[PDB]
Design a protein around this ligand. Structure first.
Ligand SMILES: [Cs+]
Ligand SMILES: [Cs+]
Lengths: 213, 213
């Protein structure tokens, strides 16, 4: 429905801008910001027609303020999600602790030894080799050793405490399920890939234990 | 007429995009491209509403093609303006040549010695010091020595020929008006600040003549 290039290009140009906006909004939505969509289009129209209800200076100071509002809204979201994640997490940890063979350490680690292991147990300065699979309590995975095409080996005092504590509950050749509260893991802050305050679930197999070189 | 930040920011966002487009169009217009304005808005609306009549791939290949069309349209404009500028220029040169004291060199330089000068006349390897004022035939200035807060000094074989030829028609202390056709100047191409095929008009005063060091 374009009769010429002038029309097609113009439309393509608009379309690409319309998609640009649509995608920016979705980005904003994930930070807890929902912009009035009709106003957004009304701004485009008004300005294009030289009838913006905001002055160029206003537009510019408002966008600057919006930037601040985004950083700030993200912060608030982070904290909201942090509260929800620990609420869910606490409930999950509490159900799991009621299952067979499950123990809760004074630190709050919930663990289940599945195979005792016959070697010895690692200590803080030891390098461990492990197979593992980790997920969030909704069951979605963030790490799989397995799929990575290989197991991992690392010194034990480097990793998060929930883990270092957990792997000390078994010996070489052992298997253990760890349910780690956020404070033994990535905290309320969290890290890229792990949401704020999340409880982590790991199946771990300890393949080997080596002393610090 | 915003009842809250959600509305104001959204509008500001649109407005800034609407201005962005408006200004891009004006840029395109100077390259000889006039986009259908209703289609531009229709693209923004359709895509925003998830009903673009173009696929994302189409949008992208069309914009790429538009880029080519811009480079190409600019070229065509340049040549059109080149033809108009020489048409105007030829007429101006022809009127001026009919005035008192005006001569046309075999090269097409049109010149008018206003004060003969009493020194000697520069030669190609000489450094000249000059006052000058240059404009296009519509009378708009691109250079003023005068206003620059100073006169200029340069070797004479470096500058455009129309000039080097012209300043040889007077001696130190002389004054001359030069009307230079494009081929003795910046050509059909032209240079930043000088439109394609423009005839240049200079009032020049030769303050000094020095030999190449
Ligand atoms: Cs138990
Ligand atoms: Cs004449």
């Amino acid at each position: 429905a374009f009769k010429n290039d002038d029309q097609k290009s113009a439309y393509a140009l608009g379309a690409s801008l319309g998609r640009y906006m649509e995608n920016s909004l979705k980005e904003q939505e994930k930070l807890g910001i929902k912009l009035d969509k009709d106003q957004l289009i009304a701004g485009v129209q008004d300005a294009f027609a030289d009838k913006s209800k905001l002055s160029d200076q206003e537009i510019e100071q408002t966008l600057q303020a919006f930037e601040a509002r985004v950083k700030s809204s993200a912060q608030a979201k982070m904290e909201k999600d942090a509260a929800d994640n620990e609420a869910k997490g606490k409930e999950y940890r509490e159900k799991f602790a009621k299952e067979k063979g499950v123990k809760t350490s004074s630190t709050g680690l919930v663990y289940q030894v599945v195979e005792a292991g016959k070697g010895e147990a690692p200590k803080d300065s030891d390098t461990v080799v492990v197979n593992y699979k980790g997920t969030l309590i909704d069951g979605k995975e963030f790490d799989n050793s397995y799929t990575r095409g290989e197991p991992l080996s690392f010194r034990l005092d480097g990793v998060i405490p929930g883990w270092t504590e957990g792997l000390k509950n078994i010996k070489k050749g052992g298997k253990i399920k760890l349910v780690i509260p956020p404070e033994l893991a990535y905290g309320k802050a969290g890290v890229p890939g792990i949401p704020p305050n999340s409880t982590l679930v790991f199946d771990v197999e300890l393949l080997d234990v080596k002393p610090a070189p």
